[PDB]
Amino acid sequence: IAHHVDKGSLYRLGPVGINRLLNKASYNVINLSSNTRSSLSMNSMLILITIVSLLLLVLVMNVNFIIVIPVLISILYILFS
Amino acid sequence: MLILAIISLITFVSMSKLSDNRAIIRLINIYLILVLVLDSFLYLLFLNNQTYTVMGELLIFNSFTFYIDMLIYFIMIVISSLYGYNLYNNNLYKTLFEPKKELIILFLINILGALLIVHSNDFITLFVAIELQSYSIYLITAIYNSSYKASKASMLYFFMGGILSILIAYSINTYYSVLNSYTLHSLDSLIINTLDLNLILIALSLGLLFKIGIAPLHKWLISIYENTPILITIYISLIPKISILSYLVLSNISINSLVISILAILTLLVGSVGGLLQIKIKRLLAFSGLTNAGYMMLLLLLNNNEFSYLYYITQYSISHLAIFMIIIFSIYYINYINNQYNPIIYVNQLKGLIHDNAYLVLSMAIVVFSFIGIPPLLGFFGKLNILMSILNNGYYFISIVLIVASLISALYYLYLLNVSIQDKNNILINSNETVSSVLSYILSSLIILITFGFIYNSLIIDIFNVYFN
Amino acid sequence: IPSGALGQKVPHVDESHQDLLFRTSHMVEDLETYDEDSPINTSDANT
Amino acid sequence: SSSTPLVKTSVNYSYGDYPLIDADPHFKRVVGYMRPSDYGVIGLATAALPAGICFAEWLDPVKGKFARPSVKFLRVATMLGFAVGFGAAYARSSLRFFGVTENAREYKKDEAQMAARKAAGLEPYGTSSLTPELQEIAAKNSAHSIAGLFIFPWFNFVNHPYHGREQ
Amino acid sequence: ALFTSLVGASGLGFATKFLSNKIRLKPAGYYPLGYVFSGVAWAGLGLVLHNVHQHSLEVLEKKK
Amino acid sequence: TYYFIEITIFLAILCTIFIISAKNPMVSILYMIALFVIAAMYLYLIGLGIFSLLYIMIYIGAIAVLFLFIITLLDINSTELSVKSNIRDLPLVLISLIVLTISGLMIYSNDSILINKLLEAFGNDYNTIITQDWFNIENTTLLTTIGNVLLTNNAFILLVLAIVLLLGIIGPISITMKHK
Amino acid sequence: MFIGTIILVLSFLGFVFNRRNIILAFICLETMLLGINLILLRNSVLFDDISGSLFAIVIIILAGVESAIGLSLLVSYYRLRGVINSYGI
Amino acid sequence: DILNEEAKIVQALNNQRELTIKMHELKREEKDYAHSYSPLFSDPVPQGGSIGKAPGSSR
Ligand SMILES: CCCCC/C=C/C/C=C/CCCCCCCC(=O)O[C@H](COC(=O)CCCCCCCCCCCCCCC)COP(=O)(O)OCC[N+](C)(C)C
């Protein structure tokens, strides 16, 4: 209990696992714009992606709201990982 | 009376030499003070939420917008004090904190364009004022042109502001194509039911909001805030935020919007976990602005959000202003000055600040715990009154995402504290020259507001009750 | 060890980070030294 | 002909406790009806800007040790001080026309003056050199322009027929 | 009470004068006349805020 | 001479494609000047003969002259439209073309229905009936009414616009002087 | 509405996928403003009013001033770097 | 002596609760055009565009 439960798995749901999750999620969202030599082409393609993607999402989303929850979960997965 | 100052000022500045610039700013500083003191009795016009429209339904003047212009003048008095007063009389701080000849011109033209957004009733007033303040931020960014980073930042800000201004123009003329009108006073509670104005009004709000730095399109603004020098970036971070958000809160065109709720959740997420592993203090300091603009995107969904808004606005303004002024003051104690425009960059450079001027760390700790929302301080009641409006109106998942975002954002706020209360080997004992009396009094005023401003909450709620209801 | 709000390794930035191997590195615009505006990097800028 | 207002308008819609005088007074009436305390406010602001610059130099001097500011700064300070004082006095005096502050001193003057203009056999608010369309648009521009004194100065110089009153 | 409001706002002025002295790495009573200057200024702000709340209460009771 | 508007629409498409794919940077800018001329053709075509000459005076005669003047005495590198560079772009170009095109066509419509919103943009076929009424007695053309409403109802917009023109004077000077 | 919509959309996508130089970005910005003008002036003609013509004559002037401002911004970008890169700023 | 001083505080807190519920009612209440828009020129009727005007254009 003192090793595998209290120092083991109650820290994985606590301060030791959250540090690793936030380390990975922060690394991914900082490397979101690591790629291109260009500042301007990067950001102006990034503006295009969202005003396309949001419009596509609401096109899905007034049809049915159930089929757009996993789309947003997958967008969070590729954004934070 | 801003117009008078601009008209007087460019006349006066064309004839001054460059030796006189700093003193000119001092003049304008005192001028704005006597526009606050001698002219604020106009609050008596706005009893019981009496609203005026001026210039033929062109501008709208209520008490909300009166408070916003008072706030913008107070902040301009602080910023112009930062330019017009010396920190120290060294040959160091003269080559670091030096105003250009045309800096206060662009300051007052930007304050003009920022006021004509919040005071605006029609869409072409909104457009002309947005471009007035946008060209002013282009030129305020580009005015320290002997700098590679500020030049690249002004070019980037030009193109990314041009796109999002053409998106606002497209939304305005798209609104015009379905309604022969320019007002949102045209809407009047029945048209929204029988007309799909959703896509129009949301695209308008989005084109207005991407200039603040909301989350899908946030990185270009974080790069502009890191690349600009340390005095410019305290002004260009604050003024478009409060002007555009004070427009979009006064006009309630995105009430219960699904897109604004998506982007508010995403803003609270990416600002909290975005600035965690970051080692530059203006980066760290700009993701704080990203989260605190998320907390406003929340109030955009709201109907009747004027208390939570105005309280959290002057909260964030005082806290923002103070945390930039504290790291202006910490430049005297760092062992390494690079980069003449931006002399402190890395947040580990303030490492032994408790052993050199411990009361600067008392200052810092107060404003950082108010950023977190600790109850004796003023940021707590801002977050509290935002929660009282979020929960009143049915945004239950948004509430828990707000709480998790504030808990995650507390980490990199406390990282400033964790660095500054630490051991350092070579500490100061005896320093000959002093910090500015005029300018350290301003930082102490900004702290005493944050700590002892919870006293006046009930007075402020009663004065609220009379002038807005 | 300097730490970086998650217990991570962060670089201590002294004057020794702007050489010409540190010139135009591959990196994010965060966590990057070699500023372009430095009294050792300009050093007869418009002469 | 050239005085029918041809619109529908507030009648005695007072903005405070006290009854209104005008919904936008003419510039001549505001300069005519201002109190000696208002001229004291103008003198206060004219004195406070150069004294304020001298004060702020005495607190923190520009080049390290204290000198008086130049006379070229003191004269611009005095000009802008008269600008602040005139804006303050115009706003103060306009508040009495709107009925948001005490105006029993000026209410007597207006009933005396409109009785005089009835006795002289002319129009109650002045003959204007404008068509009534232009009078109406010109007074939609300057209606309640004392709010927003912080942004821009704007005044009423048109003799238009309507001022939020009856008969 | 008006007097308690004035004395408390003057205490806020004393606090901001003290804290600005101590940021400057001065002693506390470095310049002792700035204490009365700051106290009179913040007490004047308290005077303004008290009068505005008073007029506000009178407007609220006039809706009887 | 019916299909004139269709012809200007098609020629404008073709001119933008020649703008974004051009050897030399100023070959691209001359295609932009040609697009301004196609615009002024469309504006005379629809009935706005005043605006077309305003476009030729302001956009061609000042903005394009400033632009060509910039390209002359400044050095600008340019890659040309390699196929290795830009067909990595093409799938998102195609998706965003169809989506942004349909979406720009979407907001002229009021339906609950998605593609009734779309195909009411193509319900164009009906020929407007122009009637004569004899109610107007004078030569108030369009420039006269722009001068009436810039100057009476929107006089404040004209004066804030004067501040914008002032800023366009002050700013470029303030950048490029290097005071002593 | 067709000509203004398609010049705005093609102008926007030519701006977005510009990787070749910087002045293509400027001229794609100006052609975007042209397309906005086209849509608005057609709506003013169809609705029989000047108010779209009012916003159009104001946005002409604002487009001119933005071109002047931004090209001085490019000149100051060029002052310290006597070259403008092909990939961008 | 203490029950009365608690009933005084309870009355003073129920007064604040009544005041708060009232001031919440007051904002959601609809409001006049003369109070919401500018007071002078209280009618929403535009009558705009007065040079080449047609008789029969009013309704
Ligand atoms: C001679 C005086 C000259 C005028 C001075 C004006 C300076 C403008 C400064 C702005 C930033 C500094 C905070 C000051 C907050 C003032 C609160 C207030 O009074 O704002 C009101 C409530 O605000 C609201 O809803 C919400 C406001 C939230 C405030 C939250 C911060 C609380 C703690 C700081 C304020 C208390 C400090 C008092 C220290 C003695 C709304 O507008 P009012 O028409 O009634 O204004 C009237 C103020 N007059 C009379 C001085 C003109």
PDB file of C-alpha atoms in Angstrom, chain B residues 288-458:
ATOM      1  CA  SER B 288      -1.662  35.030 -19.221  1.00  0.00           C
ATOM      2  CA  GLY B 289      -3.360  37.525 -21.512  1.00  0.00           C
ATOM      3  CA  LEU B 290      -4.604  34.660 -23.681  1.00  0.00           C
ATOM      4  CA  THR B 291      -6.336  32.993 -20.711  1.00  0.00           C
ATOM      5  CA  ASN B 292      -7.694  36.275 -19.370  1.00  0.00           C
ATOM      6  CA  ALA B 293      -9.158  37.029 -22.805  1.00  0.00           C
ATOM      7  CA  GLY B 294     -10.740  33.589 -22.722  1.00  0.00           C
ATOM      8  CA  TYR B 295     -12.574  34.620 -19.523  1.00  0.00           C
ATOM      9  CA  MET B 296     -14.114  37.462 -21.622  1.00  0.00           C
ATOM     10  CA  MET B 297     -15.085  35.245 -24.508  1.00  0.00           C
ATOM     11  CA  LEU B 298     -17.110  33.498 -21.814  1.00  0.00           C
ATOM     12  CA  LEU B 299     -19.011  36.716 -21.026  1.00  0.00           C
ATOM     13  CA  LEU B 300     -19.704  37.255 -24.732  1.00  0.00           C
ATOM     14  CA  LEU B 301     -22.191  34.350 -24.506  1.00  0.00           C
ATOM     15  CA  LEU B 302     -24.005  36.165 -21.710  1.00  0.00           C
ATOM     16  CA  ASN B 303     -26.918  38.509 -21.630  1.00  0.00           C
ATOM     17  CA  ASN B 304     -26.578  41.343 -19.076  1.00  0.00           C
ATOM     18  CA  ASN B 305     -22.896  40.874 -18.279  1.00  0.00           C
ATOM     19  CA  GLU B 306     -21.881  44.448 -17.469  1.00  0.00           C
ATOM     20  CA  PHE B 307     -20.852  43.974 -13.835  1.00  0.00           C
ATOM     21  CA  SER B 308     -18.637  40.943 -14.317  1.00  0.00           C
ATOM     22  CA  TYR B 309     -17.100  42.547 -17.393  1.00  0.00           C
ATOM     23  CA  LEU B 310     -16.235  45.982 -15.991  1.00  0.00           C
ATOM     24  CA  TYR B 311     -14.963  44.594 -12.693  1.00  0.00           C
ATOM     25  CA  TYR B 312     -12.727  42.033 -14.368  1.00  0.00           C
ATOM     26  CA  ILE B 313     -11.551  44.659 -16.900  1.00  0.00           C
ATOM     27  CA  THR B 314     -10.208  47.102 -14.361  1.00  0.00           C
ATOM     28  CA  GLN B 315      -8.928  44.108 -12.378  1.00  0.00           C
ATOM     29  CA  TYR B 316      -6.935  42.770 -15.315  1.00  0.00           C
ATOM     30  CA  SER B 317      -5.778  46.241 -16.327  1.00  0.00           C
ATOM     31  CA  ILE B 318      -4.315  47.106 -12.911  1.00  0.00           C
ATOM     32  CA  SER B 319      -2.760  43.638 -12.511  1.00  0.00           C
ATOM     33  CA  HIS B 320      -1.341  43.638 -16.065  1.00  0.00           C
ATOM     34  CA  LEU B 321       0.064  47.166 -15.647  1.00  0.00           C
ATOM     35  CA  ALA B 322       1.676  46.326 -12.304  1.00  0.00           C
ATOM     36  CA  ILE B 323       3.287  43.062 -13.416  1.00  0.00           C
ATOM     37  CA  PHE B 324       4.923  44.788 -16.368  1.00  0.00           C
ATOM     38  CA  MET B 325       6.117  47.664 -14.155  1.00  0.00           C
ATOM     39  CA  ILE B 326       7.679  45.254 -11.620  1.00  0.00           C
ATOM     40  CA  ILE B 327       9.829  43.636 -14.307  1.00  0.00           C
ATOM     41  CA  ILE B 328      10.753  47.103 -15.507  1.00  0.00           C
ATOM     42  CA  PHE B 329      12.086  47.634 -11.985  1.00  0.00           C
ATOM     43  CA  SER B 330      13.955  44.334 -11.833  1.00  0.00           C
ATOM     44  CA  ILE B 331      16.352  45.366 -14.647  1.00  0.00           C
ATOM     45  CA  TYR B 332      18.594  47.138 -12.125  1.00  0.00           C
ATOM     46  CA  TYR B 333      19.373  43.858 -10.373  1.00  0.00           C
ATOM     47  CA  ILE B 334      20.045  41.443 -13.219  1.00  0.00           C
ATOM     48  CA  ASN B 335      23.616  40.346 -13.919  1.00  0.00           C
ATOM     49  CA  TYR B 336      23.181  40.373 -17.685  1.00  0.00           C
ATOM     50  CA  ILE B 337      21.608  43.030 -19.906  1.00  0.00           C
ATOM     51  CA  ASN B 338      21.261  42.023 -23.524  1.00  0.00           C
ATOM     52  CA  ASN B 339      19.236  43.493 -26.308  1.00  0.00           C
ATOM     53  CA  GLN B 340      18.874  47.278 -25.698  1.00  0.00           C
ATOM     54  CA  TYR B 341      15.181  47.315 -26.629  1.00  0.00           C
ATOM     55  CA  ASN B 342      14.253  44.309 -24.472  1.00  0.00           C
ATOM     56  CA  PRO B 343      16.795  44.191 -21.638  1.00  0.00           C
ATOM     57  CA  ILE B 344      15.312  41.340 -19.587  1.00  0.00           C
ATOM     58  CA  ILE B 345      14.058  38.306 -21.478  1.00  0.00           C
ATOM     59  CA  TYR B 346      14.569  35.113 -19.547  1.00  0.00           C
ATOM     60  CA  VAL B 347      12.570  34.622 -16.385  1.00  0.00           C
ATOM     61  CA  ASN B 348      15.513  33.043 -14.536  1.00  0.00           C
ATOM     62  CA  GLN B 349      17.226  36.461 -14.667  1.00  0.00           C
ATOM     63  CA  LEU B 350      15.166  37.714 -11.703  1.00  0.00           C
ATOM     64  CA  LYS B 351      16.407  34.838  -9.545  1.00  0.00           C
ATOM     65  CA  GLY B 352      17.746  36.527  -6.467  1.00  0.00           C
ATOM     66  CA  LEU B 353      15.207  39.299  -6.246  1.00  0.00           C
ATOM     67  CA  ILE B 354      14.256  38.728  -2.619  1.00  0.00           C
ATOM     68  CA  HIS B 355      17.797  39.521  -1.457  1.00  0.00           C
ATOM     69  CA  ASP B 356      17.924  42.716  -3.541  1.00  0.00           C
ATOM     70  CA  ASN B 357      14.790  44.845  -2.903  1.00  0.00           C
ATOM     71  CA  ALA B 358      12.563  42.364  -1.074  1.00  0.00           C
ATOM     72  CA  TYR B 359       9.591  44.744  -1.246  1.00  0.00           C
ATOM     73  CA  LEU B 360       9.673  44.463  -5.030  1.00  0.00           C
ATOM     74  CA  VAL B 361       9.075  40.762  -4.378  1.00  0.00           C
ATOM     75  CA  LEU B 362       6.245  41.667  -1.989  1.00  0.00           C
ATOM     76  CA  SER B 363       4.797  43.713  -4.877  1.00  0.00           C
ATOM     77  CA  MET B 364       5.330  40.822  -7.293  1.00  0.00           C
ATOM     78  CA  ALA B 365       3.795  38.238  -4.952  1.00  0.00           C
ATOM     79  CA  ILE B 366       0.699  40.384  -4.409  1.00  0.00           C
ATOM     80  CA  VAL B 367       0.013  40.835  -8.110  1.00  0.00           C
ATOM     81  CA  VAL B 368       0.777  37.179  -8.967  1.00  0.00           C
ATOM     82  CA  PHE B 369      -1.576  35.855  -6.279  1.00  0.00           C
ATOM     83  CA  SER B 370      -4.215  38.242  -7.626  1.00  0.00           C
ATOM     84  CA  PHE B 371      -3.621  36.744 -11.078  1.00  0.00           C
ATOM     85  CA  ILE B 372      -4.303  33.326  -9.556  1.00  0.00           C
ATOM     86  CA  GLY B 373      -7.413  34.599  -7.773  1.00  0.00           C
ATOM     87  CA  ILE B 374      -6.593  34.519  -4.060  1.00  0.00           C
ATOM     88  CA  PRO B 375      -9.506  35.901  -1.990  1.00  0.00           C
ATOM     89  CA  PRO B 376      -7.980  38.907  -0.143  1.00  0.00           C
ATOM     90  CA  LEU B 377      -6.972  40.369  -3.518  1.00  0.00           C
ATOM     91  CA  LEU B 378      -8.859  41.928  -6.371  1.00  0.00           C
ATOM     92  CA  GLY B 379      -8.514  39.184  -8.989  1.00  0.00           C
ATOM     93  CA  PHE B 380     -10.561  36.797  -6.905  1.00  0.00           C
ATOM     94  CA  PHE B 381     -13.701  38.909  -7.046  1.00  0.00           C
ATOM     95  CA  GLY B 382     -13.259  39.232 -10.796  1.00  0.00           C
ATOM     96  CA  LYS B 383     -13.163  35.458 -11.236  1.00  0.00           C
ATOM     97  CA  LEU B 384     -15.977  35.130  -8.682  1.00  0.00           C
ATOM     98  CA  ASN B 385     -18.299  37.532 -10.477  1.00  0.00           C
ATOM     99  CA  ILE B 386     -17.517  35.824 -13.773  1.00  0.00           C
ATOM    100  CA  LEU B 387     -18.533  32.489 -12.197  1.00  0.00           C
ATOM    101  CA  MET B 388     -21.730  34.045 -10.813  1.00  0.00           C
ATOM    102  CA  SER B 389     -22.700  34.936 -14.383  1.00  0.00           C
ATOM    103  CA  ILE B 390     -21.532  31.670 -15.933  1.00  0.00           C
ATOM    104  CA  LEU B 391     -23.499  29.484 -13.507  1.00  0.00           C
ATOM    105  CA  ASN B 392     -26.601  31.713 -13.523  1.00  0.00           C
ATOM    106  CA  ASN B 393     -26.966  31.179 -17.254  1.00  0.00           C
ATOM    107  CA  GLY B 394     -26.444  27.442 -17.684  1.00  0.00           C
ATOM    108  CA  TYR B 395     -22.800  27.058 -18.743  1.00  0.00           C
ATOM    109  CA  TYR B 396     -21.901  24.100 -16.588  1.00  0.00           C
ATOM    110  CA  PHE B 397     -19.142  22.431 -18.590  1.00  0.00           C
ATOM    111  CA  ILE B 398     -17.626  25.879 -19.241  1.00  0.00           C
ATOM    112  CA  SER B 399     -17.447  26.370 -15.458  1.00  0.00           C
ATOM    113  CA  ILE B 400     -15.371  23.252 -14.805  1.00  0.00           C
ATOM    114  CA  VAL B 401     -13.122  24.047 -17.781  1.00  0.00           C
ATOM    115  CA  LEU B 402     -12.665  27.559 -16.291  1.00  0.00           C
ATOM    116  CA  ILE B 403     -11.647  26.034 -12.955  1.00  0.00           C
ATOM    117  CA  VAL B 404      -9.213  23.530 -14.475  1.00  0.00           C
ATOM    118  CA  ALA B 405      -7.766  26.299 -16.660  1.00  0.00           C
ATOM    119  CA  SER B 406      -7.182  28.558 -13.655  1.00  0.00           C
ATOM    120  CA  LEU B 407      -5.531  25.705 -11.755  1.00  0.00           C
ATOM    121  CA  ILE B 408      -3.225  24.946 -14.694  1.00  0.00           C
ATOM    122  CA  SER B 409      -2.428  28.642 -15.205  1.00  0.00           C
ATOM    123  CA  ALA B 410      -1.466  28.992 -11.530  1.00  0.00           C
ATOM    124  CA  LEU B 411       1.674  26.919 -12.244  1.00  0.00           C
ATOM    125  CA  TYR B 412       3.411  29.385 -14.523  1.00  0.00           C
ATOM    126  CA  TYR B 413       2.232  32.346 -12.444  1.00  0.00           C
ATOM    127  CA  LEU B 414       3.910  30.830  -9.399  1.00  0.00           C
ATOM    128  CA  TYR B 415       6.978  30.034 -11.459  1.00  0.00           C
ATOM    129  CA  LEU B 416       7.767  33.778 -11.312  1.00  0.00           C
ATOM    130  CA  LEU B 417       7.560  33.582  -7.514  1.00  0.00           C
ATOM    131  CA  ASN B 418       9.551  30.329  -7.393  1.00  0.00           C
ATOM    132  CA  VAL B 419      12.351  32.008  -9.312  1.00  0.00           C
ATOM    133  CA  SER B 420      12.404  35.299  -7.398  1.00  0.00           C
ATOM    134  CA  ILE B 421      12.385  33.929  -3.838  1.00  0.00           C
ATOM    135  CA  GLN B 422      15.661  32.030  -4.129  1.00  0.00           C
ATOM    136  CA  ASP B 423      19.233  32.220  -2.921  1.00  0.00           C
ATOM    137  CA  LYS B 424      21.725  34.344  -4.844  1.00  0.00           C
ATOM    138  CA  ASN B 425      25.456  34.567  -4.221  1.00  0.00           C
ATOM    139  CA  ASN B 426      26.243  38.284  -4.744  1.00  0.00           C
ATOM    140  CA  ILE B 427      23.596  40.500  -3.183  1.00  0.00           C
ATOM    141  CA  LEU B 428      23.323  44.279  -3.107  1.00  0.00           C
ATOM    142  CA  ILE B 429      24.172  46.248   0.026  1.00  0.00           C
ATOM    143  CA  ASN B 430      24.547  49.895  -0.961  1.00  0.00           C
ATOM    144  CA  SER B 431      23.405  51.670  -4.086  1.00  0.00           C
ATOM    145  CA  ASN B 432      23.984  55.344  -4.750  1.00  0.00           C
ATOM    146  CA  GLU B 433      21.141  56.261  -7.086  1.00  0.00           C
ATOM    147  CA  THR B 434      17.442  55.903  -6.450  1.00  0.00           C
ATOM    148  CA  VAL B 435      14.367  54.876  -8.422  1.00  0.00           C
ATOM    149  CA  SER B 436      12.008  57.631  -9.548  1.00  0.00           C
ATOM    150  CA  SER B 437       9.761  58.982  -6.824  1.00  0.00           C
ATOM    151  CA  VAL B 438       7.033  59.794  -9.349  1.00  0.00           C
ATOM    152  CA  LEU B 439       7.142  56.387 -10.913  1.00  0.00           C
ATOM    153  CA  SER B 440       7.498  54.098  -7.920  1.00  0.00           C
ATOM    154  CA  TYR B 441       4.543  55.898  -6.357  1.00  0.00           C
ATOM    155  CA  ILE B 442       2.537  54.630  -9.342  1.00  0.00           C
ATOM    156  CA  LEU B 443       3.514  50.998  -8.709  1.00  0.00           C
ATOM    157  CA  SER B 444       2.645  51.365  -5.024  1.00  0.00           C
ATOM    158  CA  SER B 445      -0.726  52.900  -5.915  1.00  0.00           C
ATOM    159  CA  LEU B 446      -1.382  49.970  -8.252  1.00  0.00           C
ATOM    160  CA  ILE B 447      -0.563  47.506  -5.450  1.00  0.00           C
ATOM    161  CA  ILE B 448      -2.661  49.241  -2.787  1.00  0.00           C
ATOM    162  CA  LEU B 449      -5.569  49.120  -5.249  1.00  0.00           C
ATOM    163  CA  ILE B 450      -5.108  45.347  -5.702  1.00  0.00           C
ATOM    164  CA  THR B 451      -4.719  44.459  -2.024  1.00  0.00           C
ATOM    165  CA  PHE B 452      -7.123  46.929  -0.374  1.00  0.00           C
ATOM    166  CA  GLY B 453      -9.664  47.216  -3.178  1.00  0.00           C
ATOM    167  CA  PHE B 454     -11.990  44.557  -1.782  1.00  0.00           C
ATOM    168  CA  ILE B 455     -12.988  47.176   0.815  1.00  0.00           C
ATOM    169  CA  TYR B 456     -15.054  49.172  -1.660  1.00  0.00           C
ATOM    170  CA  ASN B 457     -16.979  46.253  -3.220  1.00  0.00           C
ATOM    171  CA  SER B 458     -20.311  47.170  -1.648  1.00  0.00           C
TER     172      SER B 458
END
